[PDB]
Structure 1
Amino acid sequence: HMNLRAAGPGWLFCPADRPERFAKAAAAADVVILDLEDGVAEAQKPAARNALRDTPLDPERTVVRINAGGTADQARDLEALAGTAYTTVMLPKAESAAQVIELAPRDVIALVETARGAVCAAEIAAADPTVGMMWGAEDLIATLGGSSSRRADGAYRDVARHVRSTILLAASAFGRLALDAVHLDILDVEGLQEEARDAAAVGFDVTVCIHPSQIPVVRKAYQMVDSPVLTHAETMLR
C-alpha cells in the first residue's frame, strides 16, 4: 500500500498526543511513525486517537504504531484508525504470525522486542500482512528480566546483537523491510553514527529515530574481487 522503499531511511517516532508537532516531524523525517503505544501515557491515549483523526499526515509517508496484540488499547486504536487514510501499522511486542494476521487487511511492520517474538521471527516475517520487521532492544531486555541493553562502552549486549541479526535475516528472507532499533541516547551522535553505518553496511533499510536531530545523522550514514563484491560497490554508488 505504501512505497516504503522509495522513502529515505530516516524514520521518526512522533507521539500522537502531540498534534502540534506532526507537521514538524513530517518535514524532518522520511517517514513518520505516529505513536499510540509507549510514546503516549496511558491517560493520554484517548486524546492521541482523536489527534490521529483530526490532524492528518501524508499516508504515503506515515505509519501508525498501535498497541500490543490482545490489549483493549489495540481495539480502541483500530477503531480510531477506521476514520483515517492510513494503511500501515506497526505492531509492538509482535509475537506470532496470528497477531500479524489479525491486523489484515492492513500492512504490518512487526516490532519484535520480546523473546517469544525473536523465537518466532521467521513465522512473523512470513505472515501475509507483514511488510517490515523492526526490533527493540529496551523492551527485549525489560521482558527478559534484565537491566540494560548496552555495555559501558555503549555497544549492544550479546542477546541484543543476536535479535538484531535474527530480525534482519527474517525480514530479508521474506522480502520485508528491515528496520534497525532506536538509539535512545539522543545526544550520543557518535554512537548513532557508528550504529547506523553498521546497520546500512549489512543491509538494514531504515534506522528508526526518536528525535529529529537524529535524522540527518541516519541519512548521511546510509584481495580477490568476485561477483558479490562488485554488488557491494554498486550498492555504494546507489
Structure 2
Amino acid sequence: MNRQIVRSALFVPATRPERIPKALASGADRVIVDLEDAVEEGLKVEARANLRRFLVDTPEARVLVRINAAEHPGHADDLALCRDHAGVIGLLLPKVESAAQVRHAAVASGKPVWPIVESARGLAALGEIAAAAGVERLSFGSLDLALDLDLNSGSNAAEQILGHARYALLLQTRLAGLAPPLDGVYPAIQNRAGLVEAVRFARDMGFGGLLCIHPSQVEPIHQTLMPSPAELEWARRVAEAGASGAGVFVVDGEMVDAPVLGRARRLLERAGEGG
C-alpha cells in the first residue's frame, strides 16, 4: 500500500520465535517471518503456530510473512494467518510465476503482496506480475535465480545475468507504479565491506533497499543508503546555480539541464531539505 522506501527487510525463520523480537529491535524497516524455505517441511505446522503465538502475544508488532507458494498444502493456512492478524502487514510470495498467483494471494489474505522473483518463469511474466492488483513492491531472490539458471553465484558472469533480472525489476517497478524495490540478499554475513559495496551498487541502480538475513547487516545498509557529504554538496551547488532560473548551466565542469537539476533537487529533498 506504501510508496515510501523500505531500506531493509530482515528474514527470521518462524522456527526461532525468540529471535523475532531481536529482529524487530535491530531497527530494520521491515521484519520478514519466514514459513517457507528457511522452515523444514516437518516444522512448518509448528512454525505457523509459533508465528500465531507471537502475533497474539505482541499485538503492536508489524511484520511481513514469507508464505509457502500455492503448490504447498499449507498455502491456504499461511494466507489465513496473514488475513486474521493485524500484525501481518504484507506477505512475500516466493516462486511467483504469474499474475494469477499474485491475485489469489492478495485476495485470500487481503494484504499487500511483495512478489519475489526467483525463476526464469517469474522473469518472463514480470510485466503481468508487477501489474497485478495487490502488489506493493518487487524484490529479488538472487540465490534462487542462480539455482534456476545454473549460475556460479559470485562470479562476474552470474552477476551479469542477475543484472538482467535487476533491470527487469527496476523497469517494471516504474511501469506499474510500485514502491521502490529491494535488491537481493547479501549472504557473507560478516563481510561488511562487501555488504557496503552491494548496497551502494543497488542504490545507484534505483533500488530502495535490500533484503537482509542478520541483524548486523542493518546498520551498514542504512548508513550506505544515505547520500554522502559529497553527493549532498554537489546537489546544493546544482540547486544554487539553478535558483536564478536558467535553463542550462555548468557545475563541476558538467552541463546541467532540467533532468540533472531535477535529480539534484530530489536528492536534497529525500535527505530532508526541500525548498
Summarize deviations over 1:92-140 as a string: whole Å, max 9, x none.
0111100000012321000001000001111100001111101111111
Q: Give distance in 2, aligned partners of 1:151 and 1:89.
A: 31
Structure 1 unpaired stretches of 5+: none
What's 1:70 paired with? 71
Does the 8 Å CA contact 2:82/2:91 hold for their aligned counterparts?
Answer: no
- Residues matched between the structures, number: 233
Q: Which residue of 2 aligns with 1:34?
A: 33
Query: How many angstroms does 1:228 deviate by?
Result: 1.9
Mapped pair 1:157 → 2:155: no
Contact 2:69 2:75 (C-alpha < 8 Å) held by counterparts: yes
Q: Which structure is larger by alpha-carbon Rg, 1 or 2?
A: 2
Aligned residue runs from structure 1 range 218-237, under 5 A = 218-222=221-225, 223-237=254-268
Q: Match for 1:167: what amino acid?
A: L
For 1:170, give the aligned amino acid.
Q
> Is the 1:53–1:81 contact (alpha carbons within 8 Å) kept by the matching residues of 2?
no
Deviation at 1:61, TM superposition (A): 4.2
CA spacing shift, 1:60–1:54, aligned 2, 3 Å = closer
SS where residue 267 of structure 2 aligns? helix
Note the 1:149-228 alignment, pairs <5 A: 149-151=153-155, 156-177=158-179, 178-222=181-225, 223-228=254-259
Match in the other structure for 1:98: 100
Residue matched to 2:122: 117
Residue 149 of structure 1 deviates from its aligned partner by 2.4
Task: Mark the runs of 5 or more structure 2 residues left unpaired by the alignment.
Answer: 226-253
- C-alpha displacement of 1:224: 1.0
Flag the structure with more relative contact order, 1 or 2, with Cα contacts below 8 A and sequence separation at least 6. 1
Normalised by the size of structure 2, how large is the TM-score?
Answer: 0.79
Helix, strand or coil at the partner of 1:204:
coil
Distance 1:40-1:235 versus aligned 2 partners, 3 A rule: farther
CA distance in 1, matches of 2:59, 2:262: 34
The worse-fitting range, judged by mean Cα deviation, of 123-132 and 170-179 is: 170-179
Give the drift of 1:174: 1.2
Which residue identity is paired with 2:146?
A: I
Amino acid in the other structure paired with 1:225 = V
Q: 1: distance between equivalents of 2:265 and 2:96?
A: 34
The 2-side partners of 1:4 and 1:208 are apart by: 17
- The TM-score, its normalising length taken from structure 1, stands at 0.90
> SS in structure 2 opposite 1:68?
coil
Distance in 1 (alpha carbons) for counterparts of 2:59 and 2:209: 19
What is the aligned-residue identity percentage?
Answer: 40
Q: CA RMSD in A?
A: 2.0
